[PDB]
Design a protein around this ligand. Structure first.
Ligand SMILES: Nc1ncnc2c1ncn2[C@@H]1O[C@H](COP(=O)(O)OP(=O)(O)OP(=O)(O)O)[C@@H](O)[C@H]1O
Ligand SMILES: Nc1ncnc2c1ncn2[C@@H]1O[C@H](COP(=O)(O)OP(=O)(O)OP(=O)(O)O)[C@@H](O)[C@H]1O
Ligand SMILES: Nc1ncnc2c1ncn2[C@@H]1O[C@H](COP(=O)(O)OP(=O)(O)OP(=O)(O)O)[C@@H](O)[C@H]1O
Ligand SMILES: [Mg+2]
Ligand SMILES: [Mg+2]
Ligand SMILES: [Mg+2]
Lengths: 523, 523, 523
């Protein structure tokens, strides 16, 4: 229809305003100081949102332009959020600062391209500085602190993460489940996880994560790849009597032949999942055997000459629940046999010793390791179910961040790294003045989030920022202490990766936002 | 219903205004200096457009008249864009200048017909001058520069094009694929391409290009033409078990008999493609054999007495993907057998040597050449998928332009050719004054785009244009240098063809636009 | 519902205004001087119309009354246009002048009936004068000029017509086809045309012309008339395998029996055409044989005892395309056999010589003549497809006009005949004064179109008209020359028929329009 066209700033302004609104809520929330926001819902009782991301998620802008601008930030932020596990807000905060300055520059009329380049250049420099700055992750006490940061002053989460982490081991994977009751429960789980993808996203379950969880899944394992439906079918027929959800393990399915027929021909209404059998070769078979024992189901192979058709439901094992993600597919708990599982482990363990070769040992050890498979399950209790879900989500985020953080190693929190890097960054100059300003802008952007925390403190961020900058080495302000001390000594460290991730995304967002000469919209 | 009728200028004005709006955005963008524009979308997050064409594409005018006028320019521009591969903006820019002047002339009330004729005459003269002006394409370094022009200061694209071009060879075809990852990958592809059309546009796939790509296509080759469905059918039945998309190679299908029955009788729901077998006669058979080996499928011929019905899926080969365009049909990668492919090539190669005759040698050599078939595949990485798509499109455009440019040979860029020609053109007179003015107008139009670049520079285009005109030979202004130097020496050259194409189209557009005595529209 | 009633002038005025609007656009366009008009379209990009008819066609009036009035003129004009092939505008121009005067007379309140009678009387007189005035058509150079007139200064069309005409021969029919490419191609076609009607308009194809064109038609010839479906059916069954469109040649079909069953019983969805076999008696058979040879199909006759059912598709010939019009049915190109066709021609030719009788000779010669059948095909190229269509239409119109013109013979163009006749006409008096005025009006009307051309010239038509009238013999003004010279000598001649046709229609229109005492419309 008729279009309303605006040029120049008009495009920017809408985005800017939208960004600010979203940013403002997020910024306040960010930092242990800040607090959450509330949203209405037509669907049901209104939703109250905490966590910076959630607040942003909740916030929608009536104005299309503003909303769209807001959306852009959010999407980037989420992406950073996923990878970092934390720092969603930080990216948002950074982006807002960058955008505003960039917009002003746009007002300046300096070509934004240089600025973007300068910003990117600055970002790269900052990243390098950060990496150098980053140091190894500290001990569990630090870990708890790391957890707390993700916690946003959720002491329990950090404690839980640390506790879970300790028992499982940092390396060991920890899984989160909804709490049985208000009190959290930490249980080591009997079961194994193997890294296998889901064949198709179609398989991917309802939840947003896209990990598929099956309730009481049935496990059919074929050492042989499941070439075609027909072999499968007689298994399926038993499955019809079944209907507890079916998980299928096959060495491989050729996508075209199976998928084409299956998808088009077959509705595939019945719940099914497919995963490639872990490992390859004998090891794969061995892994299958291990899985089979754990499942308590049996595996059918051509070599055995057992027929899939022949195999009944009984052959198929059952799992209490299975979760699958693209990276990995896990079975939370195969029913298994306690004796059987143990026996297999011992047998494998014996094998590990038996094999002279390291390689043989490794495969066996890996196999046993999986079978022993101490997976941590963490239950989060809550006063209410809703709370539990909220808590659980937070916990999960924290866990990821913590795990990443430990490996990456700690960097000073409080945006100390950001401020510190900026000073170094400032010296660096862009190719051209326009770039230079952008570079400066980026530096300014980095500084801001420190200020925000200070603002939450109510201390004047200027002094703090100045002081922070002045201090060499790792210098920072601890909100809780409200005292100056080494970040490391304080033990409050934000993950390198999260910081880096957020910054990069934020920078990207800002750059993208800046360059629009013109907008068109409908009237 | 009731009509709102306007006479004379009223018709023109709407078009003119519409043209200007579209043109303005395009003009600024054009040239390495310029920048892109943004568009909203109801469908999803708003679309931000760069590249002159895209900006134009994005821009829609609320006013029907204006929009229509804008559309007219765009359509012509695109046509020029396709052929030239570049210069979409240039044509638009040229058109706008011409149109405005023509409109003014219309205001003058001079009969536009003469003007159009004069313009056409001028265009022809200019074209001739350009052709003479044009010189052979320069080396790869120039090529990169050529690439950059298409790049619109996309250094990477030019580099990629040059790099791809070098390895493949200029003559060798280069294909672009989406990047696997952010980093670009250049891989020579194993596979052959043969120039065959698609039997029907119906076959033509979803994408706008209309080239059809099949995922994991199955290749059925019959040396014999596939007369009727019935012979095909048993192949199809196997195909039913199949469903990875089927590509059919047949010597010929008589359109009426097969098509009539097939289309009407048969939904043709299942994905299928048909291509004529390459070559004719023994050579065709030989080509088929080469294809068959590459595919790894087998070919069935009456002479063999193999039956299509008899032939199973296995006989049909598979391709990783196939792309078909009207001009040519290619298989990106037949699974083939590495040994088999090599062996065939050697055998053919031996044949080439064996044949005394040049003709025999040529056919064989062509066959081997296809089999060796170093096709370049270029993967474009991107920060985001969206970016990659955008980049890829740009890359593709650049590649076409570069290829065309090299063969055509370089002409001075910067609209140097255009300005230069105009001066010569000016001397030429139209038959009548009205024609004369039109001729002058065309000349003026040519000059303008040089100015636009200058304007982007911010230098006063008048001086530059004057200076450029003054210089004899190839004289031009390099935006980047902002120094006067030989265009050739500078090595920044716009393709002759692109320039010529754009000019002709623009002229055509302008002429068309000019002549409307009256408009009618609904109220 | 409620009606808005107007009496007297109110009815007229709407029509008059509508007429003027349509007329004005047309008048300007008419004459080589004039230019075309543009129209919008919701459907797609707006349609730009040239050619007087098209402009009129495009122009629609919002007002119902005006529109209706406009429509009336157009419809008559088109009718004249078809017959004349040219002079669509002229009729319109004439009508407008007549109508206005008549309306004024209506204002006068003189009974329009007399005026109409007077006008008719004047027209008749004028016609007689014109006929006497008309002279034989001139040579090809004139023909080109004739072509140009239809051309409306389309030099190419005239040239093409002349060129086509020369090769084909004036007598020989010329057919127009869309150009293969921009360059026109003139090819003599191998094929025969026979004058046969289409049995039913139902058969009549989609296009407005109503001529039916079949793509790759199949030709079934029965010497015997195709009495019933049943005999046909087995042919049809083969046809089902077919589906390239089927053309049927039968001696006769009794309408009721076949049609009733066929239409009602049978959807007749499958494309089919029926034509009566050319000629009757042995000659008809002979013609069929000639057709059959040309088609390459075979004919089945009862005498032969061949069965239609028995006859397969193979027996049926195929044609590249067939065009059928009510007057005649032609096959553009039967596949035929080159040798076969030639042989038949020779055989017939021998027969022609062989037959002593003129009658026998004539039939044979006609048969051979058809087989030799040099039909001219003219391809019109265009810059764009749209242009080509437009050009083609113009070309076709020109061809008809030219052919008619040549036979009729030339009359002075420029409305010279019209002006000349009027003077003579003026002397003639109507029965009564009211008639007299009408007669004068008609005379005035004739004069006007000369003026319009002059107006386009910008010369004052009064002087020209006066001068033209003054000159005895053929005196006229040549727009291009802008010099006075003999029309014949100038060689610019408008066809007698076209002029006569247009005048008569215009007069009819004017008369019809004039007499409405009252109008009623809805509110
Ligand atoms: N006591 C503290 N002293 C200094 N800064 C602190 C302290 N506790 C936390 N912070 C800082 O506050 C930020 C963590 O808060 P938060 O997790 O809300 O930010 P975020 O991760 O960007 O937002 P979200 O978690 O909603 O994505 C980090 O920069 C962290 O170092
Ligand atoms: N350094 C330079 N000096 C002079 N002119 C330059 C320079 N770099 C590019 N140009 C000119 O700018 C134009 C190329 O820009 P662009 O590709 O945007 O124009 P376009 O092809 O008409 O637009 P589009 O590519 O959007 O169709 C050419 O005329 C080219 O010669
Ligand atoms: N050089 C000329 N000198 C005099 N009159 C001319 C000349 N060329 C063409 N004409 C006249 O102009 C008229 C032909 O133009 P045109 O074909 O547009 O009129 P039309 O046939 O009535 O309109 P249309 O072709 O749209 O129906 C004729 O009367 C013809 O004699
Ligand atoms: Mg956080
Ligand atoms: Mg370009
Ligand atoms: Mg005409």
């Amino acid at each position: 229809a008729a279009k309303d066209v605006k040029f120049g700033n008009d495009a920017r302004v809408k985005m800017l305003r939208g960004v600010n609104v979203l940013a403002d809520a997020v910024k306040v929330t960010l930092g242990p100081k800040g607090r959450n926001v509330v949203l209405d819902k037509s669907f049901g009782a209104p939703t109250i949102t905490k966590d910076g991301v959630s607040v942003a998620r909740e916030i929608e802008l009536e104005d299309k332009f503003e909303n769209m601008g807001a959306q852009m930030v959010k999407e980037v932020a989420s992406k950073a959020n996923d990878a970092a596990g934390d720092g969603t807000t930080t990216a948002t905060v950074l982006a807002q600062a960058i955008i505003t300055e960039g917009l002003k520059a746009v007002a300046a009329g300096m070509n934004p391209m240089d600025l973007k380049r300068g910003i990117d250049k600055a970002v790269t420099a900052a990243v390098e500085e950060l990496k150098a700055l980053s140091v190894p992750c500290s001990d569990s006490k630090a870990i708890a602190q790391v957890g707390t940061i993700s916690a946003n002053s959720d002491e329990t989460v950090g404690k839980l993460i640390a506790e879970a982490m300790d028992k499982v081991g940092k390396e060991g994977v920890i899984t989160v489940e909804d709490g049985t009751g208000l009190q959290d429960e930490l249980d080591v789980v009997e079961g194994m996880q193997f890294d296998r993808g889901y064949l198709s996203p179609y398989f991917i379950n309802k939840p947003e994560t896209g990990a598929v969880e099956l309730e009481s899944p049935f496990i059919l394992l074929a050492d042989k790849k499941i070439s075609n439906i027909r072999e499968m079918l007689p298994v399926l027929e038993a499955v019809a009597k079944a209907g507890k959800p079916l998980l299928i393990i096959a060495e491989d399915v050729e996508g075209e032949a199976l998928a084409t027929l299956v998808v088009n021909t077959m509705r595939g209404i019945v719940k099914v999942a497919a995963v490639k059998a872990p490992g390859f070769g004998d090891r794969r078979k061995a892994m299958l055997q291990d899985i089979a024992t754990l499942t308590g189901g049996t595996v059918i192979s051509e070599e055995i000459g057992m027929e899939l058709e022949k195999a009944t439901l009984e052959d198929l094992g059952q799992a209490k629940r299975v979760v699958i993600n693209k990276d990995t597919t896990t079975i939370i708990d195969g029913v298994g046999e306690e004796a059987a599982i143990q026996g297999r482990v011992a047998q494998i363990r014996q094998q590990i010793e038996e094999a002279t070769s390291d390689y043989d040992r490794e495969k066996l050890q890996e196999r046993v390791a999986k079978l022993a498979g101490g997976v941590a399950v963490i239950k989060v209790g809550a006063a209410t179910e809703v709370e539990m879900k909220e808590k659980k989500a937070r916990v999960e985020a924290a866990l990821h961040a913590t795990r990443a953080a430990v490996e990456e190693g700690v960097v000073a929190g409080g945006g100390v790294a950001l401020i510190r890097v900026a000073s170094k960054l400032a010296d660096l100059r862009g190719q051209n003045e326009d770039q230079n300003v952008g570079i400066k802008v980026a530096l300014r952007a980095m500084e801001a989030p420190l200020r925000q925390i200070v603002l939450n403190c109510g201390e004047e961020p200027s002094v703090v920022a100045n002081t922070v900058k002045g201090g060499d080495g790792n210098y920072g302000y601890n909100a809780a202490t409200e005292e100056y001390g080494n970040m490391i000594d304080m033990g409050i460290l934000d993950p390198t990766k999260v910081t880096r991730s957020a910054l990069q995304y934020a920078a990207s967002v800002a750059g993208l936002m800046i360059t629009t000469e013109c907008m068109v919209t409908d009237l």
